[PDB]
Amino acid sequence: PKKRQELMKWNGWGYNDSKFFLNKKGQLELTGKRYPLSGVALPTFKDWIQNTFGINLDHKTTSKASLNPSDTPPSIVNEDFLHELKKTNISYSQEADDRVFRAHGHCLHEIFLLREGMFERIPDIVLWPTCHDDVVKIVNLACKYNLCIIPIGGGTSVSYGLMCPADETRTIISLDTSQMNRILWVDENNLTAHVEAGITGQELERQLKESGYCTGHEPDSLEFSTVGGWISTRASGMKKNIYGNIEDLVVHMKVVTPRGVIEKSCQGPRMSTGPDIHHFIMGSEGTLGVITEATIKIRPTPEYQKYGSVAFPNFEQGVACLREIAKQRCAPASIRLMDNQQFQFGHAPNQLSVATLLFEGDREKVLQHEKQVYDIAAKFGGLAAGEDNGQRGYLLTYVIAYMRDLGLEYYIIGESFETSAPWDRVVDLCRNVKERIRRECKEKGVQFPPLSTCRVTQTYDAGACIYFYFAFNYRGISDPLAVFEQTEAAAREEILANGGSLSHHHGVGKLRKQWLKESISDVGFGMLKSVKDYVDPTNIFGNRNLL
Amino acid sequence: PKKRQELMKWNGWGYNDSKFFLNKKGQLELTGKRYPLSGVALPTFKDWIQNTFGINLDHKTTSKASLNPSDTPPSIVNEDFLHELKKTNISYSQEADDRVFRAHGHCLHEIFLLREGMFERIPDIVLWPTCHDDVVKIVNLACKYNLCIIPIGGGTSVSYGLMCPADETRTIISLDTSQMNRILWVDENNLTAHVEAGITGQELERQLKESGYCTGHEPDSLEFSTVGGWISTRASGMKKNIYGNIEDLVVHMKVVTPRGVIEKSCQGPRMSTGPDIHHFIMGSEGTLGVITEATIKIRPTPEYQKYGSVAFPNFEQGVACLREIAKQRCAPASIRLMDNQQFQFGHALGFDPNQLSVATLLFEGDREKVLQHEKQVYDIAAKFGGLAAGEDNGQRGYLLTYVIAYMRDLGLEYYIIGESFETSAPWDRVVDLCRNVKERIRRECKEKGVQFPPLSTCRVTQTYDAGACIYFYFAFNYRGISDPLAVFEQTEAAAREEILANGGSLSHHHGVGKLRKQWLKESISDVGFGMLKSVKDYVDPTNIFGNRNLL
Ligand SMILES: Cc1cc2nc3c(=O)[nH]c(=O)nc-3n(C[C@H](O)[C@H](O)[C@H](O)COP(=O)(O)OP(=O)(O)OC[C@H]3O[C@@H](n4cnc5c(N)ncnc54)[C@H](O)[C@@H]3O)c2cc1C
Ligand SMILES: Cc1cc2nc3c(=O)[nH]c(=O)nc-3n(C[C@H](O)[C@H](O)[C@H](O)COP(=O)(O)OP(=O)(O)OC[C@H]3O[C@@H](n4cnc5c(N)ncnc54)[C@H](O)[C@@H]3O)c2cc1C
Ligand SMILES: CCCCCC[C@H]1C(=O)O[C@H](C)[C@H](NC(=O)c2cccc(NC=O)c2O)C(=O)O[C@@H](C)[C@@H]1OC(=O)CC(C)C
Ligand SMILES: CCCCCC[C@H]1C(=O)O[C@H](C)[C@H](NC(=O)c2cccc(NC=O)c2O)C(=O)O[C@@H](C)[C@@H]1OC(=O)CC(C)C
């Protein structure tokens, strides 16, 4: 649907039919029938929240139920442009609902603003191209009328990637790709799919599975995030150990820029023809052009899958076990190491951690793989905690972002963030980042100590991906968004000073801009600028992400 | 050694001590003791050469005996620059011999000219930095005095990437990285090695082995090719199915550009921090700066290695089997499918012996896993009519790896011009591309009046999810042909046109250099090409890195 508010929340994650509410029995439960925890009462959840954040659940916050249309800036757009746009039959909207839906990602700041304030700037017009040639016309129009374009796909960005710069005086088009969503074809001999960039991941897998195929790329946002999004942000997913990350999955792509269309002439698997121009575009975050089409690898649907789980004496032993697993290059499809606090949350001794596992592929090969991993983990005090437990521990994957909305209903601001680091920095980085979060919250006037946990979510030869989760009761803090912002940016500084990356997969957008030049060196930065100024000399792709 | 020609050949591949010759018994043999095949007579080789190319092995070709300093252009070099350079103690040389050694790689055309002629242009001075800070001083000086720098590592380019543009009128520095060759350190905890970019593959693997580690990156030029070279040309190696290719191995890198030092601030395994600047350097072919250092992944030395081999009814069945192996993601460490003509050559040293094709295999890693892998691969191969042909036949199938380039020098002593080229292609193009390219080569030869039909064979060399790497081998008897290089040059160009028209890439691993520039813009789009050009003009605005590769 073009009117996204029809099915999806204008002011939070996901579908209108799916939210946490207090049932007849006074227990927490997700509305709808969409997820395997939809309609499943969670008896202890309420107490966990009381005791963790120190609240009743007496006073719900009150927030906007709809856009307030008196607060939405006016849609400024040229008539001659509009006149030419009319002739193309490219569908468009100047309605405030449509324009506000596409002015934001799913960063905390943005969500909180939707519920309480309004945006400084939002697009002036929304266009829904349906194919590559529409995107060619739009881009040509935008050159002709000095327009600005900000592509959006899923709108799942967590980096201020879609945010309209406040002092951008030109007409901002939101170039929405949701209608450019066909599987053009499956190539069964080469095992690739030629797709349009607006297809969502849920819809990509659904279609391919009708022919017996999958991509196996499974970011947590896959119900809404798109092929073009993934390429633009260097997305990563849960089973990258078998299937690869987006840089491993993309065989070919087509891109529209002000200068013309970028495309390689060949679809061969690996080349040496200079600096790989695919990597000039991957991670380009809407700044260079529109990714219209991509060829992506596919695989037969896996024959078998099996969950598993392991208890360790403590986090540090789990990390050493994960390190050993990587060293033997025998990481399962997924492996996550959860700290004690998260093990406690999942339980509804104070040191133990739990790893969850998912094996998939051939039945025989899964079972061998499984014996290998358990035998490794034995040597770090790790004990098999059961197959159904491991499954239980992937049940929350697609409901977590609905928990964040639940918390905003009761004065709790929460957010996750992430990094990758060398294996020899992981232990220190986890400890010191968590401590910097608490120290900052104490020092900013926060009553209870925050929820501050961590988890190891991917292993690599050279290190691991680490997720942090941060939440706090903000009730009667003066400026509760400045405190979040300040603490998040402090957590980021800490990450960098402990040998962490600026981002493993969320990207940079405008949220992490300030650290990029240091991350990639001044010359690196200047090389990015040179490609921008050649490809987009008047800054038509004006989201101002990155540089 | 700074004076490379003391140990290595000035006009050819490899070591002065290793060359094919006719022994006391009139049989071909490789001299010295470097390779398993050194000092091992090849009784049938001489006859295969005669039958294949239609020549007697009596009339030797008469080549230039030695590097003539007088044949070279004079070394012209601003004196103030020279004064400045002496103060730094960086070793340097203006001697003809050193300059000519670093004026070329190993394209057939460059070797031919070495043997019978002289290059239109050669570096004016050779510098030997020993470390990163040295390279900074040199580039700073090259900026100041308007010098053109052409980096050199092993000198093993097959893309005219070291060739000095003929109309370049500035002083050309050859910046030789061979003395900048330390393993700076091994990080056993992250499994990475921080190395200087002039270290060779042989020397890197030898030092790592001493601690029980390897990279497992094994290009066929590994005796002489360097870390900086691999990065600059996107090199690929034999066991890339296990270890990865250069873009999978490199975790970090340091590059000296005229604009300053490029370097990421962290060494995390994988980031999302915009377009990946390592891919701006990898494949840059000396056009942007000098790669000084890199951090490369290492592994523990494998527990166990084992060869194998399979014979298929024909090539096409062999290809379907490799495709099936790739589909099941069970490629062994190395797998190569050789066409029938190559099986005969190997043979000469109820299946039909002039249609059958042969695969060589190398498995490596844990004992148990090797065994499991070997079952799976032989089980798939049996579905395509594939029958296990023996471990020792497999091993023999890998003996020629480091000696084929010496065989080329041999051919040139007897009026035989040979070269290899490579591409990669989607799976559904492999069979036709193989057929059409070989035929194209036969046909182009015939039409330019080549007496005997050339050697024109092929080999599938690497498998990927999305396709394969293909090598073609081309050689012909050139006796009498009025202009043999022009015949070779055109036939090569035409095979490349064929490759491109049958869905193949411009290159899998050799790169573009100046030899394949004419097709780059079409391979990558004008806008693509423009992006490469923008980066060049930012990083190197006065074109110090003047080799003119790519653009
Ligand atoms: C709850 C939740 C879970 C998440 N889980 C993951 C995860 O597991 N892994 C992961 O990598 N990320 C995750 N994300 C982040 C986000 O889903 C990814 O960054 C995703 O790749 C963005 O896809 P999208 O289609 O939503 O892009 P959008 O948010 O629409 O856009 C992202 C950026 O790309 C640009 N863009 C979008 N489409 C195009 C195009 N066709 N051409 C050019 N530019 C374009 C936009 O201008 C913007 O700058 C998560 C986010 C949330 C909120
Ligand atoms: C017999 C033979 C076998 C081969 N086998 C293989 C193979 O298996 N796989 C494969 O990929 N290739 C192969 N090649 C090609 C060649 O060895 C590779 O391209 C190799 O990467 C070149 O490394 P080198 O150190 O010899 O570089 P050189 O030839 O010295 O330089 C190559 C290019 O890189 C630039 N350069 C070199 N060092 C630096 C640096 N430090 N910084 C910046 N630029 C630099 C040069 O200016 C030049 O443009 C082979 C070549 C031959 C002759
Ligand atoms: C940006 C969205 C993240 C918001 C951060 C806050 C949430 C957060 O910390 O999420 C984590 C993902 C955490 N999980 C686990 O411990 C966990 C443990 C065992 C097994 C699994 N197995 C999944 O299959 C687990 O997932 C979790 O569920 O805690 C929620 C309850 C938090 O919500 C909050 O209290 C604050 C919210 C209510 C505002
Ligand atoms: C450097 C580029 C060479 C240019 C092509 C010429 C050479 C060429 O075709 O190489 C191929 C690699 C070929 N091999 C095989 O058939 C082969 C077959 C079975 C097993 C293996 N297993 C290796 O362990 C094989 O390798 C070969 O050895 O034929 C040489 C003889 C050719 O030399 C010449 O004719 C030029 C000169 C001698 C006249």
> How many C-beta atoms lie closer than 10 Å to residue B197's C-beta?
26
Q: Are A20 and A26 in contact (CB under 8 A)?
A: no
Q: Are B270 and B259 in contact (CB under 8 A)?
A: no
Tokens representing B389 are 């042909």
**Crossing angle for the helix pair B484-501 and B430-447, nearest 10 degrees?**
150
Question: A287 - beta bridge partners?
Answer: none
Rounded distance between C-alpha atoms, residue B370 and residue B380, angstroms:
15
Q: Which residues contact A161 (CB under 8 A, 6 or more apart)?
A: A105, A232, A233, A285, A286, A507, A509, A510, A543, A545
> How many C-beta atoms lie closer than 10 Å to residue B518's C-beta?
12
Longest dimension (CA), chain A: 72
| Alpha carbon distances (Å) from A419 to A97, A105, A185, A414, B126 | 34, 19, 35, 17, 44
Tokens representing B70 are 């007088």
Tokens representing B464 are 């990927």
**Crossing angle for the helix pair B45-53 and B340-348, nearest 10 degrees?**
140
Alpha carbon of B285 to ligand 3 centroid (Å):
48
Tokens representing B520 are 């780059």
DSSP code for A83:
H
Q: Are A118 and A68 in contact (CB under 8 A)?
A: yes
Q: What φ, ψ does residue A115 adopt, rounded to 5°?
A: -75, -25
Alpha carbon of A511 to ligand 3 centroid (Å):
23
Rounded distance between C-alpha atoms, residue A329 and residue A424, angstroms:
17
Tokens representing B187 are 């990080």
From the CA of B454, the nearest ligand is 4
**Residue ID of nearest Cα to ligand 2 atom 37:** B229
Tokens representing B440 are 């194209």
Tokens representing A185 are 């074809």
**Residue ID of nearest Cα to ligand 4 atom 39:** B411
As a whole number of Å, the end-to-end CA separation of chain B is: 33
Rounded distance between C-alpha atoms, residue A62 and residue A79, angstroms:
40
Question: B21 - beta bridge partners?
Answer: B29
> What is the enclosing helix (H) or strand (E) of B520?
helix B520-524
Looking at residue A228, its amino acid is G
Question: A425 - beta bridge partners?
Answer: none
Contact flag B524-A273 (C-beta cutoff 8 Å): yes
**Crossing angle for the helix pair B132-144 and B79-88, nearest 10 degrees?**
160
> How many C-beta atoms lie closer than 10 Å to residue B259's C-beta?
19
- Atom number, ligand 4, closest to the C-alpha of residue B407: 38
When CB atoms are compared, the residue of A283, A421, A518 closest to B265 is A518
Pairing of strands B172-176, B148-152: parallel
SS3 A503: coil
- Which residues on chain A are in Cβ contact (under 8 Å) with B277? 520-521, 524, 527-528
Looking at residue A522, its amino acid is D
Closest CA to A337 of A393, A403, A298: A393
Rounded distance between C-alpha atoms, residue B328 and residue B503, angstroms:
24
Closest CA to B505 of B421, B422, B424, B420: B424
**Residue ID of nearest Cα to ligand 1 atom 35:** A286
* Residue the block writes with tokens 């601690």: B211
DSSP code for A153:
S
Q: Which residues contact A137 (CB under 8 A, 6 or more apart)?
A: A88, A90
Rounded distance between C-alpha atoms, residue B41 and residue B82, angstroms:
51
SS3 A68: coil
Tokens representing A64 are 């906007």
B510 contacts chain A (CB < 8 A): yes
Q: Are B433 and B499 in contact (CB under 8 A)?
A: yes
Rounded distance between C-alpha atoms, residue A407 and residue A484, angstroms:
14
Pairing of strands A192-196, A290-297: antiparallel
Q: Are A420 and B270 in contact (CB under 8 A)?
A: yes
Closest CA to A124 of A536, A542, A510: A542
- To test the pocket of ligand 2, the residue of B128, B135, B182, B232 to mutate (highest count of ligand atoms within 8 Å of its CB) is B232
Contact flag A462-B192 (C-beta cutoff 8 Å): yes
What is the per-residue DSSP string for A455-487? Answer: EEEEE-SSEEEEEEEEEEE-TT-SSHHHHHHHH
Alpha carbon of A399 to ligand 3 centroid (Å):
9
When CB atoms are compared, the residue of A285, A499, A500 closest to B274 is A285
Quote the distance between the C-alpha of residue A439 and its chain's center: 27
Closest CA to B376 of B328, B338, B336, B423: B328
Rounded distance between C-alpha atoms, residue B103 and residue B117, angstroms:
13
> How many C-beta atoms lie closer than 10 Å to residue A323's C-beta?
21
Closest CA to A133 of A94, A172, A74, A180: A180
Closest CA to A68 of A96, A105, A101: A96
Closest CA to A421 of A376, A457, A382: A457
Residues 179-238 of B with CB under 8 A from A: 187, 189-192, 233-236
- Which residues on chain A are in Cβ contact (under 8 Å) with B283? 272-276
Closest CA to A265 of B531, B530, B501: B501
Question: B476 - beta bridge partners?
Answer: B417
Tell me how close the Cα of B280 comes to any Cα of chain A, in angstroms: 5
**Crossing angle for the helix pair B108-116 and B404-413, nearest 10 degrees?**
40
Chain B residue nearest residue A298, CA to CA? B465
Tokens representing B82 are 């020279």
What is the per-residue DSSP string for B148-202? Answer: EEEEESS---SSS-SPPPTT--S-EEEEE-TT---EEEEETTTTEEEEETT-BHH
Closest CA to B383 of B461, B342, B327, B428: B327
A282 contacts chain B (CB < 8 A): yes
Q: Which residues contact A83 (CB under 8 A, 6 or more apart)?
A: none
* Residue the block writes with tokens 């946990």: A453
| Alpha carbon distances (Å) from B454 to A54, A132, B421, B459, B484 | 84, 46, 15, 16, 13
* Residue the block writes with tokens 């390219």: B437
Closest CA to A421 of B271, B110, B67: B271
- Which residues on chain B are in Cβ contact (under 8 Å) with A234? 271-272, 276
Rounded distance between C-alpha atoms, residue A463 and residue A459, angstroms:
6
Tell whether the torsion through CA atoms of B36, B39, B44 and B50 is positive or negative: positive
* Residue the block writes with tokens 């700066």: B289
The answer to whether the CB of A12 is under 6 A from ligand 1 is no
The dihedral region occupied by A509, where left means phi > 0, alpha psi between -120 and 50, and beta the remainder, is left
CA angle, corner A105, sides to A408 and A82, nearest 5?
Answer: 130
Tokens representing B115 are 């043997």
Residues B90-115 as b/e (b if ≥16 CB within 10 A, e otherwise) read bebbebbbbbbbbbbbbbbbbbbbbb
Q: How many residues does this entry show for chain B?
A: 551
Q: Are A341 and A406 in contact (CB under 8 A)?
A: no
Rounded distance between C-alpha atoms, residue A366 and residue A387, angstroms:
13
Q: Are A307 and A333 in contact (CB under 8 A)?
A: no
Q: What φ, ψ does residue A155 adopt, rounded to 5°?
A: 55, 30
Rounded distance between C-alpha atoms, residue B510 and residue B281, angstroms:
16
Tell whether the torsion through CA atoms of A270, B333, A304 and A461 is positive or negative: negative
What is the per-residue DSSP string for B233-293? Answer: HT---TTHHHH--HHHHEEEEEEEETTEEE--S---S---SSS-THHHHTT-TTSS-EEEE
Quote the distance between the C-alpha of residue B375 and its chain's center: 33
* Residue the block writes with tokens 């706090």: A472
SS3 A391: helix
Rounded distance between C-alpha atoms, residue B109 and residue B112, angstroms:
5
Q: Which residues contact A247 (CB under 8 A, 6 or more apart)?
A: A234, A278, A279, A282, B276
Rounded distance between C-alpha atoms, residue A356 and residue A309, angstroms:
5
Alpha carbon of B474 to ligand 4 centroid (Å):
10
DSSP code for A33:
S
Catalytic residue among A213, A467, A469, A474: A467
| Alpha carbon distances (Å) from A280 to B228, B460, B527, B531, B540 | 21, 30, 12, 8, 18
Q: Are B281 and B231 in contact (CB under 8 A)?
A: yes
> How many C-beta atoms lie closer than 10 Å to residue B322's C-beta?
25
Rounded distance between C-alpha atoms, residue A509 and residue A286, angstroms:
9
Tell me how close the Cα of B351 comes to any Cα of chain A, in angstroms: 28
B518 contacts chain A (CB < 8 A): no
- A402 part of the active site: no
- Which residues on chain A are in Cβ contact (under 8 Å) with B538? 526-527, 529-530
Rounded distance between C-alpha atoms, residue A180 and residue B429, angstroms:
29
* Residue the block writes with tokens 């260097």: A234
> How many C-beta atoms lie closer than 10 Å to residue B403's C-beta?
19
DSSP code for A71:
G
Substitution target in B266, B431, B509 with the highest count of A β-carbons within 10 Å is: B266
> How many C-beta atoms lie closer than 10 Å to residue A376's C-beta?
18
Contact flag A280-B281 (C-beta cutoff 8 Å): no
Tokens representing A197 are 């960039």
SS3 A368: helix
Tokens representing A527 are 């090389």
Q: Are B536 and B529 in contact (CB under 8 A)?
A: no
Ranges of beta strands (E only) in B94-147 are: 125-128
- Can you give the C-alpha Rg of chain A in angstroms? 23
Q: What φ, ψ does residue A523 adopt, rounded to 5°?
A: -65, -45
**Which residues lie with the beta carbon below 6 Å from any ligand 4 atom?**
B 49, 338, 342, 345-346, 397-401, 404-405, 407-408, 410-411, 416, 418-420, 455, 457, 473, 475
- Atom number, ligand 3, closest to the C-alpha of residue A405: 39
Alpha carbon of B8 to ligand 2 centroid (Å):
17
CA quadruple B211, B217, B221, B223: dihedral, nearest 10: 0
> Does B408 show up as a binding residue in the annotation?
yes
SS3 B83: helix
What domains, with CATH codes, occur in chain A?
A: 1-16+61-180 (3.30.43.10), 17-60 (3.30.160.650), 181-301 (3.30.465.10), 302-398 (3.30.70.3450), 399-506 (3.30.300.330), 507-547 (1.10.45.10)
DSSP code for B14:
S
Find the discontinuities in chain A where C to next N exceeds 2.5 angstroms and give the residue preceding each. Answer: 348
Rounded distance between C-alpha atoms, residue A370 and residue A357, angstroms:
9
10 Å CB burial of residue B355 (0-12, 13-18, 19+) is: middle
What is the per-residue DSSP string for B495-519? Answer: HHHHHHHTT--S-SSS--TTTSGGG
From the CA of A49, the nearest ligand is 3
| Alpha carbon distances (Å) from A498 to B195, B223, B239, B267, B369 | 23, 39, 35, 11, 37
Rounded distance between C-alpha atoms, residue A344 and residue B136, angstroms:
55
Closest CA to B1 of B181, B174, B135: B181
DSSP code for B34:
S
Longest dimension (CA), chain B: 76
CA angle, corner A232, sides to A458 and A112, nearest 5?
Answer: 80
SS3 A118: coil
Tokens representing B124 are 């004016």
SS3 A382: coil
Rounded distance between C-alpha atoms, residue B468 and residue A270, angstroms:
8
Rounded distance between C-alpha atoms, residue B458 and residue B546, angstroms:
35
Chains A, B: CB contacts within 8 A come to: 292
The answer to whether the CB of A244 is under 6 A from ligand 1 is no
Q: Which residues contact B356 (CB under 8 A, 6 or more apart)?
A: B311, B312, B313, B314, B340, B343
* Residue the block writes with tokens 């079409």: B522
Contact flag B469-A259 (C-beta cutoff 8 Å): no
Contact flag A502-B257 (C-beta cutoff 8 Å): no
Looking at residue B170, its amino acid is R
- Which residues on chain A are in Cβ contact (under 8 Å) with B467? 190, 267-270
Chain A residue nearest residue B189, CA to CA? A424
- To test the pocket of ligand 4, the residue of B404, B413, B422 to mutate (highest count of ligand atoms within 8 Å of its CB) is B404
Closest CA to A394 of A473, A503, A309, A275: A309
Alpha carbon of B334 to ligand 1 centroid (Å):
38
Rounded distance between C-alpha atoms, residue B168 and residue A185, angstroms:
49
Rounded distance between C-alpha atoms, residue B111 and residue B370, angstroms:
41
Tell me how close the Cα of B530 comes to any Cα of chain A, in angstroms: 7
Residues 102-161 of A with CB under 8 A from B: none
Q: What technique solved it?
A: X-ray
CA quadruple A317, A318, A324, A327: dihedral, nearest 10: -130
Catalytically annotated residues of B: 471
Contact flag A267-B538 (C-beta cutoff 8 Å): no
